[PDB]
Subunit: 184 residues, 2 copies
């Protein structure tokens, strides 16, 4: 009931306006008082963390259901996961506009990031196997994730605008990202 | 001076809201009526094209003033141009955010695209020498441009948020971009 409605409103409002989406606005759009929102979530940051996990779970389920586990070559496995990733974002654009902003907000706790990484162990493992070491470090991992998110967002935008060439934007985005971020 | 007021306000508005920025908002922010805005620019698309050339010319004049012709190695010259590009965006974050939204808008005329392309000859010809075929193509050059501007904006935002490590973000952003977009 109202927990879900609050997460839907925060999805719509964060997609519409970014993190600095007003909790008054989100509460209003969920049809309760702002005091009720702060009863369900101790702080705005708690609400951000919870919404990120809910959206990440939805994305990870979608990618997992498409996984061909006979594939073991790192690049081919990552290509097919990328396809699934860009497809989810084209199919759920508000969810995706909500999630990418939470990901770079620097508001996510280490526990949340860790739970998010654990939602899809094969992808977590493939990062360890293939991403340039500097982009797995504590100092530069956020930057490597921002570069990735930037390349995936651009690919989604070009594919959504021009569906006839979506496949080709997805393939050219993937090869560019793989050259940008992976072991040489 | 109203024309310059209107271009400055359109920059701030497009940085914030993309090309869906409101002409009513832009005009009110410049201190003029919307009808006045349409006396200077008869369509929103004319405002978009004029602003894009004004911002591009500013950025290119900045890079040309910084060009060091002692650098005779192509990748190194491209790196130092990159450093000037990132520095311009860190000095002028709304200008670069607006240029990126304008460049990827599908509203620029062929005339505008031709004028932009020949503002900085050394750079135009470094691109022709270095960029992957497919990102020079009629079909996919606009996507190559989108990927570059996404990588550049990412680098700017990290360098601005964490200035202690700005040089390292600039260098890692450049190396990622070079691998993404250039030839064997
Ligand atoms: C930057 C790591 N990275 C990789 C990745 C890229 C290249 C090789 C291996 C994994 C990834 C690959 C696909 N297909 C889909 C999503 C992600 C991704 C998603 C979020 C994030 N924060 C990092 C992510
Ligand atoms: C993608 C072309 N590319 C190159 C470039 C990239 C790699 C090799 C040679 C040139 C570039 C290099 C520097 N440093 C600064 C700006 C640009 C740039 C700027 C805009 C654009 N639309 C394409 C641009």
């Amino acid at each position: 009931d109202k927990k879900q409605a609050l997460l839907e409103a925060a999805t719509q409002a964060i997609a519409q306006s970014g993190i600095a989406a007003s909790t008054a606005v989100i509460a209003r759009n969920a049809g309760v008082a702002e005091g009720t929102l702060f009863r369900y979530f101790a702080t705005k940051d708690e609400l951000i963390n919870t919404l990120y996990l809910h959206l990440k779970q939805d994305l990870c389920q979608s990618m997992i259901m498409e996984l061909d586990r006979s594939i073991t070559d790192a690049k081919m496995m990552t290509r097919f996961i990328w396809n699934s990733y860009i497809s989810w974002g084209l199919n759920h654009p508000a969810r995706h506009r909500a999630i990418r902003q939470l990901a770079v907000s620097e508001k996510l706790t280490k526990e949340t990031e860790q739970r998010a990484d654990d939602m899809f162990p094969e992808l977590r493992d493939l990062c360890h196997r293939s991403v340039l070491m500097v982009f797995m470090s504590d100092e530069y991992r956020a930057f490597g994730d921002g570069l990735f998110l930037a390349l995936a967002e651009t690919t989604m935008d070009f594919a959504a605008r021009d569906p006839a060439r979506a496949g080709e934007y997805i393939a050219l985005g993937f090869e560019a990202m793989w050259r940008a971020l992976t072991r040489e």
